[PDB]
Design a protein around this ligand. Sequence first.
Ligand SMILES: *CC(=O)N1c2ccc(C(=O)OC)cc2NC2=C(C(=O)CCC2)[C@H]1c1ccc(C(F)(F)F)cc1
Ligand SMILES: *CC(=O)N1c2ccc(C(=O)OC)cc2NC2=C(C(=O)CCC2)[C@H]1c1ccc(C(F)(F)F)cc1
Lengths: 290, 290
Amino acid sequence: SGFRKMAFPSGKVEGCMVQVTCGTTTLNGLWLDDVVYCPRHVICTSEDMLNPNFLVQAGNVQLRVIGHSMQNCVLKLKVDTANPKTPKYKFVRIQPGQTFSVLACYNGSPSGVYQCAMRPNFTIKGSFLNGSCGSVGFNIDYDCVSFCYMHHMELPTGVHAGTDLEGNFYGPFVDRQTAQAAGTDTTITVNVLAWLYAAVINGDRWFLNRFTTTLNDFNLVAMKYNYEPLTQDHVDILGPLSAQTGIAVLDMCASLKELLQNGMNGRTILGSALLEDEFTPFDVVRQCSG
Amino acid sequence: SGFRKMAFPSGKVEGCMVQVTCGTTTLNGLWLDDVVYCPRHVICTSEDMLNPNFLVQAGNVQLRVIGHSMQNCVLKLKVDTANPKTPKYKFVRIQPGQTFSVLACYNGSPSGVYQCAMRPNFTIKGSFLNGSCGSVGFNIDYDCVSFCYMHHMELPTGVHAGTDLEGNFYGPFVDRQTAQAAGTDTTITVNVLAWLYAAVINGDRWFLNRFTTTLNDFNLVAMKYNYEPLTQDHVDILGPLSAQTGIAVLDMCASLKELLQNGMNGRTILGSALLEDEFTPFDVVRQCSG
Ligand SMILES: *CC(=O)N1c2ccc(C(=O)OC)cc2NC2=C(C(=O)CCC2)[C@H]1c1ccc(C(F)(F)F)cc1
Ligand SMILES: *CC(=O)N1c2ccc(C(=O)OC)cc2NC2=C(C(=O)CCC2)[C@H]1c1ccc(C(F)(F)F)cc1
């Protein structure tokens, strides 16, 4: 029992982390096979971010860059020694709504790990300080590591922005300091529904009134509260949770609809008095049934 | 910027994790130097938890137990090979209010990491499934690992209970299945005050009214809302946060006092509409100022 916001173990990424310096500028990079990835704005100097040559250390072991190139927004420093601590990996691209773990690092040493979601506006609500550029976000499948995120920058609203491991940015964003107003993030509705399932499994059922409602009547309400519309694909993926708790998707929709319109009222669901949207349905299955 | 509930990297603990089987019964254990720790109720059989010989595998490497002994509530399996992946460690005991990271494991393999607090009633609000007994909770200081918790059991109220690494249980609890009604956990007031600081640092200041109030007048209110009394030692440790934000401890006390009595009212502080008590003041300093 218990539900808790839970990151994957960080051991296999920690030993792929490295410190990268170019001129005065030093940040974090990822070491896989014989190539080190890192954000390309490492070649800028920071004085020039106010108005209009490589060192690679793996803790204490110096690698020689023997050349580099630029794929989109990331630099691919080719090194001579090949990392023996390279796990099974693959470079996946994430869609809004999916979640991952972030291992925040400074000067190449890991400091923390935490779980967060790729918001519908393509930003992520991270915890980043200066020096964190180059930290990676990832999922793991027992022993295969799916890298899906590298940090680049902090937008003016406090939120964060970065790329996939091939260099392409997640949203309409660029590796430069500007007022890049990202869209309003909507609340991830499939995830809120999944968290409500995790509540049921674990104790809380007061919100379960479930006046049966249809799909689109819910969507009508959902949208004038800034909830992303629910599609058939979202319904499908709740299948397993539906199966376990014996509460059809339309019911949980309906019960949430009285939450949006009649409110939490200070009442508590799984340690919270607001509707959590940063757990995917697979999250709930991994945590609530192995 | 950003505040996010953040566990220490789990790499150094992951390689001290091992699977332990005794008769039919198999769970998780910790391997340090040449001794493996694990809960002593490994020698029970589970059929007998309803009404009134060692295998140690490190993934695939079998260790020979050459003997064992019982310190309090944990078994110390002495093995012949000594773990080369043993970090700097020390066995600390935690007091209620302090926080740690839990690396949940099944059949000796790590599955997740997460952050939680030792509640004032000596229970912890974990995320544990059958098979998780023997998982450890710990803090790290850059390279020294302070082990402070090993999981034993789940109380009837869903909460969890365990020991320090020397075998002694945290509260008035025992390694047996009974209705052990633990006390009401009070809300950790020093921590709520620290989270309010992290809010200020990061954006949110609406709760800052700060009608100056005294210490004990606050305590009067605090207690009839089930908030643990605030001592001089708690005031002291908020010193640094006080220094950074330029808002004296009595002010934040006072502002929280109007939160307890005039309510959140759906309003949001750092992604939440209830008062979070599971961040220590050192947590805020580590996350908000390196
Ligand atoms: C992500 C990060 O830690 N930093 C960062 C942020 C933005 C950009 C950018 O837009 O470049 C065009 C670059 C960086 N790079 C680095 C840092 C560092 O602190 C270390 C060196 C890499 C920080 C950073 C740097 C400068 C600033 C400033 F001055 F613009 F405000 C902020 C963060
Ligand atoms: C912590 C844990 O995972 N388990 C557990 C819980 C309590 C006790 C206990 O009170 O013993 C006197 C022992 C255990 N031990 C083990 C398990 C396992 O699933 C694997 C073997 C170790 C579980 C567990 C076992 C049995 C039950 C039961 F039947 F009592 F409900 C519950 C959890």
